[model samples]
Target: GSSGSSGPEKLPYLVELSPDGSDSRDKPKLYRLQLSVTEVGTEKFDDNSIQLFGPGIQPHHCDLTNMDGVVTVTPRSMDAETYVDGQRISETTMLQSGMRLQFGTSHVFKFVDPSGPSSG
Candidate 1:
């Protein structure tokens, strides 16, 4: 990918698993993981400032299926001020500190965290 800033930056993070015994392309496997993101100490993002980065994925990739996955979030701070998918989960804390925001599949293998420009 190029570093020219026409819009938001796209970062390609990978998710891989070791297929045991089965054929590499015919194994029934599922992997999932939670991604915890902390703001870079000097940045504060607006409520809707988050942008998901990926390879040819669309609009923050909210539809996890686009990446062959699923995602959910748990807010561990202020219960009345945090939310995911419009559902309140927890309260927002300082930009660089918070709880682990979960995003992954319910019955699949590893979940890849998106990489992009710092929300600073």
Candidate 2:
């Protein structure tokens, strides 16, 4: 897939992060984290404005940065495994508007551009 957009104004999309049952007894569903942003991660600090909640996710699992409309995912540490479309990624890779990403062992996220049809 292509990069799909341009600039640093924060890309728009329906991003969903679903917990793989690692967060127990949580909210009938502490099941997902949804947002629309250029930057996202599991970090608890300044590194990620959009952070994850619960176990299984490292403090800094991965980063999604959009530059010139091109988005890439970079694994922040050795503890978390990152996969793009089910393939494990060892290096930073470009991601498009519809891709499935699995981080660590329990979280799954996807990029869905609302301007077009969904990947679901």
Candidate 3:
């Protein structure tokens, strides 16, 4: 008997980071971070904003600056999906194949300084 069984094929996607070219040391080191899909757009719908939870670090502030980051994708196709922190961010849409999609979002991180002036 001969049979062929294979798992579901995987697609390609991308993830763009903020503070584009900043060094890892310049960014706060947090333990937990999360991303959420705040909006979605179809052929007739367009969303211009998305939001995500910032990493939990201290002292330094976190900002999502364009061109200071990078995007990681696999197979990297326009019809692919995107995710953050293991959460699905975007869905496959009909547009152009292999084309990159730009998404904008806001993030907030909180840090505590025990040795700061505010500390007792």
Candidate 4:
């Protein structure tokens, strides 16, 4: 191991999980989550990522990674429909600030990352 190698950096990313886009009195709010976003989905197995009690999230749905301050999303399966800003997406895509993510048919997520710079 050296001082300047290459690997995952410990960058602080902020995130939030809002179910059903509900600002109601019942919707759960999980705020200030990892802006890097380890992994998010509904149903999962005893493997890589944990299952998302996430809203409208499908099983092993999507993998969200924050590298160099660039957030890239990859779907574990081609069957799931992940939409960005009301557009359908299944492949790898980069996300920007204030982006609206629609998961499956019942869930919606908002990406609001206002962290520091990327050193990589």
lDDT of 1 at 63: 18
For model 3, residues 14-106, the per-residue Cα lDDT tens digits are: 233333312244544331111222132222111322233333211211112111111122212223233333233333222222232332222
Runs of candidate 2 with Cα error greater than 4 angstroms are 1-14, 17-41, 113-120
Question: Ranking by TM-score, best first?
Answer: 4, 2, 1, 3
The sequence of per-residue lDDT tens digits that candidate 2 reaches over residues 22-112 is 2245333121122223334555544325566546666666666554444577777766677776778877787766676776655666654
Best by TM-score: 4
lDDT of each: 0.27, 0.54, 0.25, 0.57
State the TM-score for model 4: 0.61
Between candidates 2 and 3, name the one with more favorable TM-score: 2
lDDT of 1 by residue, 13-103 (tens): 2233222211245543332222233221112332322333223322322212111122333232231132232233433322111122222
Q: Model 3 off-target regions past 4 Å?
A: 1-7, 15-93, 105-120
Candidate 2 local lDDT, residue 116: 35
TM-score of every prediction relative to native: 0.19, 0.60, 0.19, 0.61
Error of 2 at 117 (Å): 12
Candidate 1 lands at a TM-score of 0.19
lDDT, candidate 3, at 85: 35
Q: Which candidate is the best by lDDT?
A: 4
| Model 2: colliding residue pairs | 5-69
Give per-residue CA lDDT, model 4, range 1-120, as digits (tens). Answer: 433323334332323334345344554433333434556576544344434454445676777776655676677766667777677776879876666666675566666555544431
